[PDB]
Design a protein around this ligand. Structure first.
Ligand code: NA
Ligand code: NA
Lengths: 267, 267, 267, 267
């Protein structure tokens, strides 16, 4: 396939449709996460969906059941520890073997940092990066081989607004740096794979996935006052961006990043 | 504070659907241009579409007849000179009476520059600025008032990668600067209208709109060798983005810019 | 006459030195301010300095007297209404008639905005854009043709972080937009003037130029909490950057922007 | 002590002076490299420099010899392999002993890649990030502690234009990614250390330092044609920027990036 071409579709619903296509989502283990909302939308467009869990399959099995029944499409759960290259390789191999191919891959590494560099140890730095950055790389490396052979593919990397600015008042430089590396990785691979696959990143701001409770009333109040919208966003508001990049609705969009932060980076 | 709330739809198809809504597109009087494709996509989403045209009511009318016939929705043309605030004002006055409302407004003004500032005259800069910058500003302000009442709205500003880098080898700083202004304008307004409307910008790259003949095949190859995908975009590859921002599929995205340049900015 | 080569100087003090050179500063006209602190730093470098005043020439005369009696260099004042091309072109014709040449040009457009797009009028938008955006275009266009004849030059445009972000809680989109246009204008012009001059820009944050008394203390305490340095900056903190771009200390720096905001945009 | 206080000097020269101060440069073992030129510039300002070498002890010795001859300042070389945190911890400890203190730190971790993500091995990715990104973190963390101890300090991180774009036609995503994290490391750390030190980065473009390995002549022509200035930069053209961020001539500038690429990123 001499380079990636434009969509032969004039119809918008056809550009968005993922019938006959396969999409893998590394998140998709919880009930209201960025991951399952990515799987949700993709399934809604008619795509067979593969989803991964880190250590506990339970939540991931209950999602596969939900995705099948509600959207009536083939879905399966697989284990994946993005921080292990062997695990991500196995992921791509088992999926391709079960689904026959992989058209789009949505990677998501969400380890958080709990301090600044000075207060934090080296191990803790290394960890957030290994998982958040090296984790995304493995995903890309593992699936990029598949894409090059098929002469097609869309890689969607979940970054973060934290890849653009540093959150306040929480100190998490390790996390912000791995996220920025993630954003640029999207631009660099977009170019490296320019003949066969598209690469884009989405940078979400504060999104509630059900763990808002574990946050002090003050802390949240301060954050909201910096978000022009004045409220956290929801994962279901991130489903459109994911399908948008995984489908043929962006056949000319590669190496791009879309901040979904309620306007936080506007100030 | 709060301000704007998340979509009421869990379904992504319901998020994109523009049924029961009004969207106006400027400069959509051509066959295969960024403008019409933005109206086609929206119309496909089942929405009432109002388009505009600078001069010679020709292509606009045929588009109107064609948008109603293949999509079954209400449409209507309107003569508008974005470089005039009175004309935009009148545009939003009329549309609002024939359609009852405007939910989304897609602003487009692509006058171009054929020289640098040293070679161009002051008048040549004034014209590109007034049309491309002040015009988009005329659209925003005129619709802003309307949105501020209904407590809802989405303005999508069609910027350009030229607002990011300076094109080579053609000299067109006036055009560049203008678009840059539109890029940040949408960012500054996302903040200003945080209580009632979302504002986002799309930065297209080299889009073949059926006028490559007016450009030296030598120039194209040079452009092509700087575009990772090695080709020009097609306005249809842009409809998804316009529809993405103008609908309930992006209720937490305000102040964002999406580059659709085949990867041009990547290098 | 060759092109744009690296400095012939190995010593840093030699690259910074503006001995034998002529620099023009448009903002200086008062005892304090970004403009005056630029002239002083350049003068301290041994340059011949020409400064401008919008009117109320007395203040510009005072400064001229100071520079010459403090640094022992030659200096003079001229009137320039950056919003008038002819004024800027006459500004260049005069300086050169009296100085013989212009090596560096530091353009400053001071127009401020006092409201958002909705409350402000079109007249108000136009003014700020004409003065802040077009006025800088006028400056560059005026000094550009001279720089082209000599095969050398250094244009430094004073932008603002407002061109990077939207100030909070005051609404000043026109200003922010004009400022964005200016950051990109220096990028685009760095490429346009690539065979003869360099073009860079400075994006200062909150600088105590002498009007903090007007801004409510409550508002000033809010800004301060959003600046990691937690204070306003001082114009003496700008002269370092000014001589940097205007002197041979940056013969390979062109098309870049230097943020001096106390880490404001960092968040 | 509201965060960081502005320079007490009004004189630029007095602000640029580094007398009574100590600065360390990570890799100044060559004759015309970025680091030795940073070390000269600082010396010239009257600083006691402390350069390091990974293994080139003899090379670091010729430099110390020279730095002491021409500038008659105190200079000592040390061995440090940035990918080792232990080696950076003992770097600081040692310097603090021999010089009593460190006022400015200039890190320059620049190992290269030579291939893209698909042809490259996992270890190859790991190596570049560990030295270029984790290497830089080590320096920041090792010296960070010391800065917080004196409530003063400047860290100048040498990133790279590759941190902004992706080099063409050579594939080096790992390098670009590591550089991207370094740029954002500077902003995030600027915010983290807001109470005792500034942090900034320089993103040089292509620089002829001494060795640019074996790259076909035709590729080198390709690079030059993408550099508006049309030439490689020299390291001596980078010294002004290093001294700028290292001294008091930049007391309100923190969290910023300064591109020195002959205008490459401009396009
Ligand atoms: Na570029
Ligand atoms: Na911010």
């Amino acid at each position: 396939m001499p380079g990636q071409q434009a969509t032969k579709h004039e119809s918008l619903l056809d550009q968005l449709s993922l019938k006959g296509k396969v999409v893998v989502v590394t998140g998709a283990s919880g009930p209201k996460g960025m991951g399952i909302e990515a799987a949700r939308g993709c399934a809604e467009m008619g795509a067979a969906v593969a989803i991964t869990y880190a250590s506990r399959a339970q939540g991931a099995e209950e999602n596969v059941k939900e995705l099948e029944k509600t959207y009536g499409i083939k879905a399966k759960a697989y284990k994946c520890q993005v921080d292990s290259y062997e695990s991500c390789e196995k992921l791509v191999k088992d999926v391709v073997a079960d689904f026959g191919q992989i058209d789009a891959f949505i990677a998501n590494a969400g380890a958080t940092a709990d301090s600044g560099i000075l207060d934090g140890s080296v191990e803790a730095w290394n960890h957030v990066v290994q998982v958040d950055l090296n984790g995304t790389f493995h995903c890309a490396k593992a699936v990029g081989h598949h894409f090059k052979e098929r002469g097609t593919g869309s890689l969607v990397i979940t970054a973060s607004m934290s890849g653009h600015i540093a959150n306040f008042p929480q100190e998490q430089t390790s996390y912000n740096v791995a996220k920025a590396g993630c954003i640029h990785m999207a631009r660099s691979l977009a170019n490296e794979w320019r003949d066969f696959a598209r690469v884009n990143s989405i940078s979400p701001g504060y999104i509630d996935t059900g763990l808002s409770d574990f946050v002090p009333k003050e802390t949240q109040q301060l954050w909201h006052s910096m978000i022009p919208m004045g409220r956290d966003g929801l994962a279901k508001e991130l489903k459109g961006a994911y399908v948008y990049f995984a489908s043929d609705a962006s056949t000319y969009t590669t190496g791009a990043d879309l901040l979904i932060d309620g306007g936080y980076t506007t100030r």
